[model samples]
Target chain A: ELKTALSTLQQTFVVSDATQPHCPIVYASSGFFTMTGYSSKEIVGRNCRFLQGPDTDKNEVAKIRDCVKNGKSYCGRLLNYKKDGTPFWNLLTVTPIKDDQGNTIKFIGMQVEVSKYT
Target chain B: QTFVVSDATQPHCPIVYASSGFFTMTGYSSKEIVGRNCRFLQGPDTDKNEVAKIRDCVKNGKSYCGRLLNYKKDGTPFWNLLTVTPIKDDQGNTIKFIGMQVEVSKY
Candidate 1:
């Protein structure tokens, strides 16, 4: 039933394989594609860091990177750009999915267009 | 009002088991609900963003608590105070995700 629910969700989110190098995105919601103005073909198999641009806070990105490397959860706001070069403040949340061995196998990321809310 | 457990290892994390309360609360028979995902109760009025937030928890094999609009078997709408938790095996790998729901009147 969880799988059924996930497929229909219109929330902007992505799932990346932690076991893979660079943790490439494996699944992206339709909402993500719409919000970022990127097709699924362009986003999957790639690290979501592509959204970062010149004005993006390096410190915030560093925190996110550290959390991913350590298998921890993170919640923060960051500047993310879209395909058309439009920038938005993203309220982001990331969680690590770990196995019994305490090894992270996947990371789930949720994004909110905080600029819209603001 | 309902309880369900889904296989985390499975693709799309389908529900493999459900509680009697689930049947009573949603009016869906076990045979009709098993092997499916949970958002069956959600509808047009449901919050897509909230659903995705919940999905984020599912993907990460983490626990979540939130509220969403859902429908009963008769298509009646209700506010659901939903919670989901991961069930890990001895190796610490999350193998299952359990979801519980209670009806609420207001957001």
Candidate 2:
């Protein structure tokens, strides 16, 4: 039941293989898929930074970039685009996961929608 | 940890609120999704059995967890892994609903 519970959650999350230069997606929750409107085939093996749209704030981008480059965790809101080119606020939180050997091998990215209450 | 909230007291159990996680999943803004039945994401190709399961759960003021075929605003379809549960009032009766959605896929 624990396994079943985890897989059926309405909270969205994504697991990406950080070994690659761009940190491509490896696993995504249904919440993530629904949020992005892209299936696994569309996002897997692709850099998620691409979700940042033209209107995304540069300072916010800088923050996430710094986090990625130096292995830091991030919690911020950035403008992100959807498959249809529409944009919205992304309440993104990302953390780096390292292997037992201490080499960062994966990344766990999580975000929640925060547009309405604002 | 939770993403969205709704008022079951409203007609059709309309979505009174949607979180950013929801916008990420469906690319839909709150202006488009709020005050609407999430089933609007479905169309002719959706699974009837899955729909029925949801109906039964909501009708009985119970919680449900399962997957279904839902569509994006652009009419593109993807699988939806969902859980819908009821929030009760002080009287132990259902008052609101809380839904959590996570998308999973395989290559």
Candidate 3:
């Protein structure tokens, strides 16, 4: 069952409420807390943009924003940081979840910490 | 993959309904839980910060997503990936909160 499968997956899933202002996060998987020192309380209702640092590419961030704005999925490996400013390679993917009528409902994001992967 | 809908307009915003998926995960029969708060699933070990996040969202009538430790009916522990979004009508007044829950233990 899908309900069973989604609950046991290892991938980090952070889902956001698109209808709300600034598209704030609505759900965060445990893998997220393990990777980023920020708790759900600190990060919830905040934009994902806060996670980026100077080492991260501005264009990449813009591309993500553009893709999100267009309701398109974006996949890439980019520099990301934890709460303490430590950097890591984030293999990230952003997905839009549409309702039965094809209206966008939520934006679900998944990212993996692959420090050794290029 | 459980879905819980709560009445945002009500005092304490109690759960109005839950999906079959919710029953499958929490082992709670509908009649046993229709009038309760979702926070009942949270345990003592749940992150205080995470719990406070939902509190702020309710106070502000804002939508928020959070991950926290939750317990089921039989005292089973799991990681809950939860997002609560307000359901606003044509007048832009929020009447309900739709909460999506996913229990991801493997993190």
Candidate 4:
């Protein structure tokens, strides 16, 4: 049911299982590819930071890293580059998931395209 | 809104937007851009790998802010600060998104 809800939303959504940070499994709706101009094969198994470029904001990256390391949920705007080098805005929300032991194991992320240019 | 002198081919220049002082620094006008994806600025010089990283961030809803080389309507390139924010409805479900594109004048 959760998957169905996510799919219906037509937004890019991903889930990462516990015990892993380097490689997080990903799932995205059709809108994801449409907005990003990428295929699914090109996205999974990669750390999300590859989006950072010489022009990417380092301060924002540091804040996100701290949140993930501490196992907390966060929401904020990100300035990211497209495959074609076009700068765009992404509305991002991240939530950490915990196992039965109450330990964070995985994270879920949802992204939406917000700006036409940046 | 103020009009700034821009080189026809300077890659990263600021264009104007609807908001006062909130200019979109590219050479492209609304006529050529409205209803189109922003990727139109990309060329062979763009990095596909970086695109994937951005996808991952959005797929997982990770907030990020970064700088990037963006192009103008005439194909000029410029660097800018990009920020994105996710918007949610009353039910706390993710809906649309909001973004900001600021020209990096220091460079």
Q: Quick one: best lDDT, which candidate?
A: 1
lDDT of 2 by residue, B16-94 (tens): 7677767877788999978888888787888999899889877766656566888877777877666675654323345
Residues A1-118, candidate 4, lDDT per residue (tens digit)?
A: 3445455445466665547657465655565567667666877766667656786678877877876787665686677776777776766676655432345666667766674442
TM-score on alpha carbons, each prediction: 0.53, 0.49, 0.51, 0.50
lDDT minimum window of 10 residues, candidate 4 chain B: B1-10
**What is the alpha-carbon lDDT for the whole of candidate 1?**
0.76
| Candidate 4 C-alpha lDDT tens digits along B1-107 | 11112111223222212222223567666555434444565666666676555456544434434456767766776664544434453233434333445555542
Instruction: Please identify which of the two predictions, 1 or 4, would achieve the higher TM-score against the true structure.
Output: 1
**DockQ for all models:** 0.04, 0.02, 0.03, 0.06
Q: How big is the positional error of residue B87 in model 4, measured in Å on the Cα after superposition?
A: 5.1
Residues A37-94, candidate 3: write the lDDT tens digits.
8899988787777778989998888888886786555656578899999897776767
DockQ of candidate 1?
0.04
lDDT of 3 at A44: 79
lDDT at B49 for candidate 3? 91
Best-fitting candidate, measured by DockQ? 4
TM-score of chain B of 3: 0.93
Pairs of residues clashing in candidate 3: A26-B65, A26-B83, A27-B65
Angstrom error of the Cα, residue A12, model 2: value is 1.0
TM-score of chain B of 4: 0.63
Which scores greater on TM-score, model 3 or model 4? 3
Candidate number 2, chain A TM-score: 0.85
Question: Which should have the higher DockQ, number 1 or number 4?
Answer: 4
Regions more than 4 Å wrong, model 2: A1-9, B1-107
lDDT (Cα atoms) of all candidates against the true structure: 0.76, 0.68, 0.72, 0.54
